[PDB]
C-alpha cells in the first residue's frame, strides 16, 4: 500500500512514512510486520540510501529509524568510503560527532536511548578505522579534553575507546589487512599513555558508578594487549582488588579484569611483582569473605536460587580462582603466612564444585586436574592439600557420570585416579561408607547406586592387586546383599546391572580368579533369558566387554577344567541365545570371534570357527538348496530376514577375526555372490513391475539389506586381510562380476552406494595388484554415478560422498587407470574434481581438493612426456581459476587451507618452470615468453573481470607478492587473506601486499 512509497527515491523521503514502516516491523505482527521487513531490507540495500541518513538523524524521532540510518552509514564506511569525495568524508565525520555530543548532553536522551548512542559510537569507530590517526591526529587529545566538561560525555568516551580497542586488537584478524591492523595497533599503543592517565584518573577520583563501570569495561579490553608495567607500576591493582570489589555494580567487571590480569605477561624472577601478584589475590579473597559470602557458605544453594546476578558472579569467581591458581599457586605454597589464603581459595573452589551446573563443573574439574596432576608428579606438595583432596574425592564420586558421556567421564576418571593414588586408604573408605548408606536406605536411589557404581569402576588399576582384591570382594558382597534386601523386579534389576557393571570394570581381578569369572559368565547367560527391559542388552554388553579384556583365559585350558571354556560356550550357543533379539545374538557371536582369534594353532582356530558357525551355516545351506532350486522363495519376507541375519552373523564374526575369517568366507563365498545376483534380479523385477515406489517397500528394502550386508562382509574381510594374493585370485574377479554390472544397469534409486564403498576398500588394499580390475571399476561406476550427483549438491548424499572417496584412492594407488580413460571421460574427471570444490559438505570438499592436489603431483611425476604437457595446456588454468573462484566467493571458507595449498602448488610449477610447454596457444603472446609472465597476465585479466572495483595497481601488487611467496605457505595464506579483505571494499592500499 502506502508503505512502498519509501522505495520511490525520486521524491523526498517521507519521515513519518518511514517511522510507521519501522513501527510496523518492531511492534507489528503477521503480514503487516513481514511486508514492512521486506521494504526496510530493500530500503537499506538501496546504494543511494546513505544520502538520506543525515535527514533521518535530525528529523526523525524514532530511535529504531535512526538505528537503521546508522546501519546504512556503517555499510558505506566499511565498503564504499574511499570512493567518496574528500568533503563528504569530513561532512559525515562531523554530524556523527555532533549527534553523539548533543545526545550525551541531553540527560533525557542519554539515559533512555542507550541502544542508539552505542550504535553511533560503533559508527564513529568505523570512521576511525578509515581515517585515524593519519587524517585525525588530534582525536585522542580532543576526546581527553571533552571528558573534563561533561560526565555523560566522559562515560560515552569510555564506550568509544572500548569499541576502538575491540575493533583493533580483538577483531582485526579477519576484518582488515595485516598492514592496516599493525598501523591501527601501533597507533593506539603510541597514544595509550594519554588514554591510561584519563582511565586511572576517573577510577581514582570518580563517584559516578555508571562512569566507573564503563571505565572498567574499557579496562578489561585494554588488558588483552597493554604492557604489564601499566598495571604493576601504578596503584591500579590496589583499586581493583579492594575498592571496586566492595560495590556490587563494579564487582562483576572488576573480577573479570583481575582474571585477565592473572594472565598478563610478567617477569618470572622479580620479587616485587611476586608480592604484588600475591597482594591483589589476598585483597580480592578478603573482600569476598567480608562483602559477599564466607568460605563456609553453601554456594550450591545460592546458585540454585538464582538471585540477581549471583549465578554470573559465581561463574566469574570460579574463572578468577582457577585462572590465577593455575598460574600462580606456587607463590602461596612456600610462605607459611600465605598458607591460609591458599587453602581458603581452594575451599571456595570446593564449594563452587558442588554447584549443580554442568558447564561450571567442567571448568572447576579442569583445575582439579591441573592440581592433582601436579601433586602426583611434584614433590613435597600433596601434604598441603590433604584436606582439600579428601573433600574433592566425595565431590567427584557424588557427581560421577555414566561412561556414555565420554569427555566428562574421562576427565572425572583421570582426576579420581590421581586422587586414589595420592591416598588410596581415604578413597576406599569414602567409597565403602557411601555403599553402606545405600544399604541403610538413607541415600538410596537408582541414580545414587548407579553413580557410585560408575565411580567405584573408574579407579580400576590404581590400587595394589591385594588391596583391589579385598576391595572388590567387599563391594561385590555388599552389592549382592543389597540385591537380596531390595524388593520388586525393578529394584533388583538396577542393582544386578551395577553388580555386573563393576565386575566388568575390574578385569585384573577376573584374570586372577577363574572360578569367579566362570560364575559371572554363566550368570550373564542366565540374564540372557530375562525379558525385563535392558537386562538382555546389559548381559550382552557386559559379556563382550569382559571377553575383550580377559580373552586369553577363555582360549586356554584352566586347571580343573576338561577343556578351554570357548568350547563350552560354543556347545550351548543355541540354548544360551534362543531368547535374544537378532542383533544381540550378533554381539554374542562377535564376542566368540574375539576369543577364537587368540588361539594361534591354525587347525584349532579353524575347528572353533566352523563349530561356532554351525547354526548359521546349516540355515544357510538349507536356504541355498531351496532358493537355487526355485527363486520364488526369496519373496517370502521371513526368508529374507533369515538370510540377512545369517550374513550379519558373518559380518559380526569377521569384524572381530579379520584375516582369520577367510575359511568361513570360503564356505559361503560363491553361493553368496550367486545370491547377490538372484536378489539383484528380484529388485530390478519389482522396480519395473511396481515403479520407483518399489524401493521404499519392506520386501525390496529387505532384499537390498542382503546386498548391503554381503558388500559389508566383503569390505570387512578385505580391509583386514593379510593374504593379498588370495584376495586377488579368489575373491575379486567373482566380486567385480557380481556387483559392477548390476550397479551400472540399475536405475539411480536402486543403486547401492555401499557398492562404491566396497570398491574403495578393494582399491585401497589390492588396487596396485589389479590395474585392469580398477579400469573395470571406473567404467562401471564413474560416468553413471557422476550423473546422479552433478545436477545439485543435495541428491544422493551417500553416493556423492563414497564417489569422491573411490576416485581419491584410485588417484593415489592406481593412477594408470585415469591415463587409460579416453580424453572425453578424462575431461569429466576434471569436471568432477572442481565440482567437489563447490560443495559445502565437508566430506566431499576435502576430498575434492585432495584429489586435485594429488592429480597435480601425479602429472608432475610423469615428467616431460606428451600427456603431462597436454594436461597443462588443457587443465592448468581451469584448476587455477576454479581454485580462485572458491577462495574468493565467501561460501567455501571452511576449505581455505587446502585451497591455499592447492593454489600455491599450481603457481610453484610455473615459478620453478616444471611445466615444459608454453601455457598459451601460438600467436596469443610474443614468441620467446616465459610462463611466469603469461601467468601474471592471465591472472591480472581474470581478477580484473571478477573484481572490477579493484585498481590495476592493486591486482598487480597482490600477484607480485603471491608469486614471490609461493614457497612459504603461511605468508602466502596471509597474502590471500589480505586479498579477501580488499575485494570487500573500494580503494584498498596496494602497498599492503609488501607486509612480508
Amino acid at each position: 500500500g502506502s508503505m512502498e512509497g519509501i522505495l520511490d527515491f525520486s521524491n523526498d523521503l517521507d519521515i513519518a512514512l518511514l517511522d510507521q514502516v519501522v513501527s510496523t516491523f518492531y511492534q507489528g505482527s503477521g503480514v503487516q510486520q513481514k511486508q514492512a521487513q521486506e521494504i526496510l531490507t530493500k530500503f537499506q540495500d538501496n546504494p543511494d540510501a546513505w544520502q538520506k541518513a543525515d535527514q533521518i538523524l535530525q528529523f526523525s524521532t524514532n530511535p529504531q529509524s535512526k538505528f537503521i540510518a546508522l546501519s546504512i552509514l556503517d555499510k558505506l564506511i566499511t565498503r564504499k568510503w574511499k570512493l567518496l569525495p574528500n568533503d563528504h568524508r569530513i561532512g559525515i565525520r562531523n554530524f556523527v560527532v555532533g549527534m553523539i555530543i548533543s545526545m550525551c548532553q541531553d540527560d533525557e536522551v542519554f539515559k533512555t536511548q542507550k541502544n542508539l548512542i552505542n550504535k553511533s559510537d560503533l559508527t564513529l569507530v568505523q570512521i576511525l578505522k578509515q581515517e585515524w590517526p593519519q587524517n585525525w591526529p588530534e582525536f585522542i587529545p580532543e576526546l581527553i579534553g571533552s571528558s573534563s566538561s561533561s560526565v555523560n560525555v566522559c562515560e560515552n568516551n569510555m564506550i568509544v575507546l572500548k569499541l576502538l580497542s575491540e575493533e583493533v586488537f580483538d577483531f582485526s584478524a579477519e576484518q582488515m589487512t595485516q598492514a592496516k591492523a599493525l598501523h591501527l595497533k601501533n597507533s593506539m599503543s603510541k597514544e595509550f599513555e594519554q588514554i591510561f592517565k584519563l582511565c586511572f584518573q576517573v577510577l581514582e577520583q570518580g563517584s559516578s558508578s555508571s562512569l566507573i563501570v564503563a571505565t572498567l569495561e574499557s579496562l578489561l579490553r585494554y588488558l588483552h594487549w597493554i604492557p604489564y608495567r601499566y598495571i604493576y607500576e601504578t596503584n591500579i591493582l590496589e583499586l581493583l582488588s579492594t575498592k571496586f570489589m566492595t560495590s556490587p555494580d563494579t564487582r562483576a567487571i572488576t573480577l573479570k579484569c583481575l582474571t585477565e590480569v592473572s594472565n598478563l605477561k610478567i617477569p618470572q624472577d622479580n620479587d616485587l611483582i611476586k608480592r604484588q601478584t600475591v597482594l591483589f589475590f589476598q585483597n580480592t579473597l578478603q573482600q569476598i569473605a567480608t562483602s559477599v559470602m564466607p568460605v563456609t557458605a553453601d554456594l550450591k544453594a545460592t546458585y540454585a536460587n538464582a538471585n540477581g546476578n549471583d549465578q554470573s558472579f559465581l561463574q566469574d569467581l570460579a574463572m578468577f580462582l582457577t585462572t590465577y591458581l593455575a598460574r600462580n599457586r606456587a607463590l602461596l605454597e612456600s610462605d607459611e603466612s600465605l598458607r591460609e589464603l591458599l587453602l581458603n581459595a581452594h575451599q571456595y573452589l570446593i564449594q563452587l564444585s558442588k554447584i549443580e551446573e554442568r558447564e561450571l563443573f567442567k571448568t572447576t574439574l579442569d583445575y582439579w586436574h591441573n592440581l592433582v596432576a601436579d601433586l602426583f608428579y611434584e614433590p613435597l606438595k600433596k601434604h598441603i592439600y590433604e584436606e582439600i583432596c579428601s573433600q574433592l574425592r566425595l565431590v567427584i564420586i557424588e557427581n560421577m557420570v555414566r561412561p556414555e558421556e565420554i569427555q566428562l567421564y574421562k576427565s572425572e576418571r583421570e582426576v579420581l585416579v590421581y586422587l586414589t593414588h595420592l591416598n588410596v586408604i581415604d578413597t576406599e573408605e569414602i567409597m565403602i561408607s557411601k555403599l553402606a548408606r545405600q544399604i541403610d536406605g538413607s541415600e538410596w536411589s537408582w541414580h545414587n547406586i548407579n553413580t557410585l557404581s560408575w565411580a567405584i569402576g573408574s579407579i580400576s588399576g590404581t590400587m595394589s592387586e591385594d588391596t583391589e582384591k579385598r576391595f572388590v570382594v567387599t563391594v561385590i558382597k555388599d552389592l549382592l546383599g543389597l540385591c537380596e534386601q531390595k524388593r520388586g523386579k525393578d529394584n533388583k534389576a538396577v542393582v544386578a546391572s551395577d553388580i555386573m557393571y563393576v565386575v566388568g570394570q575390574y578385569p585384573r581381578f577376573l584374570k586372577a580368579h577363574w572360578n569367579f569369572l566362570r560364575t559371572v559368565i554363566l550368570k550373564l547367560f542366565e540374564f540372557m533369558h530375562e525379558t525385563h527391559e535392558g537386562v538382555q542388552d546389559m548381559a550382552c554388553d557386559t559379556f563382550i566387554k569382559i571377553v575383550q579384556k580377559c580373552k586369553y583365559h577363555f582360549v586356554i585350558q584352566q586347571p580343573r577344567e576338561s577343556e578351554p571354556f570357548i568350547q563350552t560356550i560354543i556347545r550351548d550357543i543355541q540354548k544360551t541365545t534362543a531368547d535374544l533379539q537378532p542383533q544381540q545374538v550378533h554381539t554374542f557371536y562377535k564376542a566368540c570371534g574375539i576369543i577364537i582369534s587368540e588361539e594361534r594353532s591354525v587347525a584349532e582356530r579353524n575347528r572353533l570357527l566352523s563349530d561356532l558357525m554351525q547354526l548359521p551355516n546349516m540355515a544357510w545351506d538349507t536356504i541355498v538348496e531351496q532358493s537355487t532350486a526355485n527363486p520364488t522363495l526369496l519373496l517370502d519376507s521371513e526368508t529374507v530376514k533369515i538370510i540377512a541375519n545369517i550374513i550379519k552373523t558373518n559380518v559380526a564374526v569377521c569384524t572381530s577375526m579379520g584375516a582369520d575369517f577367510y575359511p568361513q568366507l570360503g564356505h559361503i563365498y560363491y553361493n553368496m555372490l550367486q545370491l547377490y545376483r538372484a536378489v539383484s534380479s528380484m529388485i530390478s523385477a519389482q522396480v519395473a513391475a511396481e515403479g520407483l515406489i518399489a524401493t521404499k517397500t519392506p520386501k525390496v528394502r529387505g532384499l537390498r539389506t542382503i546386498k548391503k550386508e554381503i558388500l559389508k562382509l566383503v569390505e570387512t574381510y578385505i580391509s583386514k586381510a593379510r593374504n593379498l594374493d588370495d584376495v586377488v585370485k579368489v575373491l575379486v574377479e567373482p566380486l567385480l562380476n557380481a556387483v559392477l554390472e548390476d550397479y551400472m544397469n540399475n536405475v539411480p534409486d536402486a543403486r547401492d552406494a555401499e557398492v562404491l564403498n566396497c570398491m574403495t576398500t578393494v582399491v585401497e588394499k589390492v588396487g596396485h595388484m589389479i590395474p585392469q580390475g580398477v579400469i573395470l571399476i571406473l567404467q562401471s561406476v564413474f560416468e553413471c554415478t557422476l550423473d546422479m550427483i552433478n545436477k545439485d549438491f543435495t541428491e544422493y548424499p551417500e553416493h556423492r560422498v563414497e564417489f569422491y572417496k573411490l576416485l581419491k584412492v584410485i588417484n593415489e594407488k592406481s593412477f594408470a587407470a585415469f591415463l587409460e580413460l579416453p580424453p572425453a571421460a578424462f575431461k569429466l574427471f576434471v569436471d568432477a574434481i572442481c565440482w567437489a570444490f563447490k560443495h559445502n559438505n565437508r566430506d566431499v570438499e576435502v576430498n575434492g581438493l585432495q584429489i586435485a592436489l594429488d592429480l597435480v603431483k601425479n602429472i608432475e611425476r610423469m615428467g616431460n612426456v606428451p600427456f603431462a604437457n597436454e594436461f597443462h595446456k588443457n587443465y592448468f588454468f581451469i584448476f587455477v581459476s576454479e581454485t580462485f573462484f572458491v577462495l574468493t566467493d565467501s561460501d567455501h571458507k571452511s576449505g581455505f587451507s587446502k585451497q591455499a595449498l592447492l593454489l600455491m602448488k599450481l603457481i610453484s610449477l610455473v615459478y620453478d618452470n616444471k611445466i615444459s610447454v608454453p601455457l598459451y596457444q601460438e600467436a596469443e603472446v610474443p614468441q620467446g615468453t616465459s610462463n611466469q609472465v603469461y601467468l601474471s597476465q592471465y591472472l591480472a585479466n581474470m581478477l580484473s573481470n571478477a573484481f572490477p572495483h579493484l585498481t590495476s595497481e592493486q591486482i598487480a601488487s597482490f600477484l607480485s607478492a603471491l608469486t614471490k611467496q609461493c614457497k612459504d605457505l603461511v605468508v602466502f595464506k596471509g597474502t590471500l587473506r589480505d586479498f579477501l579483505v580488499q575485494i570487500k571494499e573500494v580503494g584498498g592500499d596496494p602497498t599492503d601486499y609488501l607486509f612480508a
Binding site: 558382597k477 533388583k492 534389576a493 544386578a496 580368579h513 572360578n515 560364575t519 537386562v535
Partner: peptide
Amino acid sequence: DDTVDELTKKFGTLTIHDD
C-alpha cells in the same frame, strides 16, 4: 581364596525374582 570362594557361591544365587 577363602573370601573369594564364599563370594563365588553368593554370586551364583543372584536373581531378579522375589520368590
